[PDB]
């Protein structure tokens, strides 16, 4: 139907993509700074102003964001076997191989996701600065006086 136009004429839907990292990481410095920034007040403010009692039984401030330390996430989720146990049994060997592959996969997933997130912030920052510079250049060309401008009547003094 007409609705498909809004989505590239794609008919049907896919399940929403899950996020490997469910919270921001401790290396996403940009986000960490924003939450630490003082909250605004006034017309466009957020929070209870000084001297304004908050509702009894309610928390005055918002809960602190939980930043994930990928090193700690990896240490608690896919910890390595503490001892090199004797896997002489056929089933023990299969389990050891499967556990090793699973640990390799999930550690690569968490570290690739963190890298992607950090690399995406840098790319956006670079792209925005470029766009800003290009806009200034474009605007400067627009403001540049051409010879044709002499034929445009003007009343600058008035």
């Amino acid at each position: 139907g007409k609705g498909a136009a809004k989505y590239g004429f794609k008919s049907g839907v896919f399940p929403t993509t899950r996020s490997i990292l469910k919270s921001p990481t401790t290396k996403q410095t940009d986000i960490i700074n924003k939450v630490k920034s003082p909250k605004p007040k006034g017309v466009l403010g957020i929070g209870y102003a000084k001297g304004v009692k908050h509702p009894k039984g309610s928390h005055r401030l918002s809960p602190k964001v939980n930043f994930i330390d990928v090193d700690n996430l990896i240490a608690k989720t896919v910890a390595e076997p503490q001892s090199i146990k004797s896997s002489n049994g056929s089933a023990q060997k299969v389990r050891l191989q499967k556990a090793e592959l699973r640990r390799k996969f999930l550690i690569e997933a968490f570290r690739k996701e963190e890298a992607r997130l950090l690399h995406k912030h840098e790319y956006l920052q670079k792209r925005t600065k470029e766009l800003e510079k290009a806009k200034e250049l474009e605007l400067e060309k627009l403001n540049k006086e051409k010879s044709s401008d002499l034929t445009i009547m003007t009343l600058d003094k008035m």
């Binding site: 399940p15 993509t17 899950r18 299969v94 191989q97 592959l101 699973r102 550690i107 690569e108």
Partner: protein
Amino acid sequence: TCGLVRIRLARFGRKNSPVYNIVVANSRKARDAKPIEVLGTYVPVPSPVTKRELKRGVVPIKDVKLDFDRTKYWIGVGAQPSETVTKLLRKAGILNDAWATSKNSNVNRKVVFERMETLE
């Protein structure tokens, strides 16, 4: 297959022309219900090779599209592949011989072509 999160084929297409989505799904949901994620596609019918190609030595190819990175993540968090999906992942080189069974264990069968990773 066990667990609550399984990697299995969901059937699409028409009668007598099956195609499949490779999906991560809750064990209890319907086979063709919208899954957690769609990892790829499996077309079971091999591409037909012409008479000349056959003598030339061309082997029919079954085509699978798969997100290799996302699939590894789901194996990492304990998702359990179905038997057919297991065969596909072992052929792709994502899973290894630790996932083979006694009935399909090709312990002694000659390799005519070795898994080759290329760019195209």
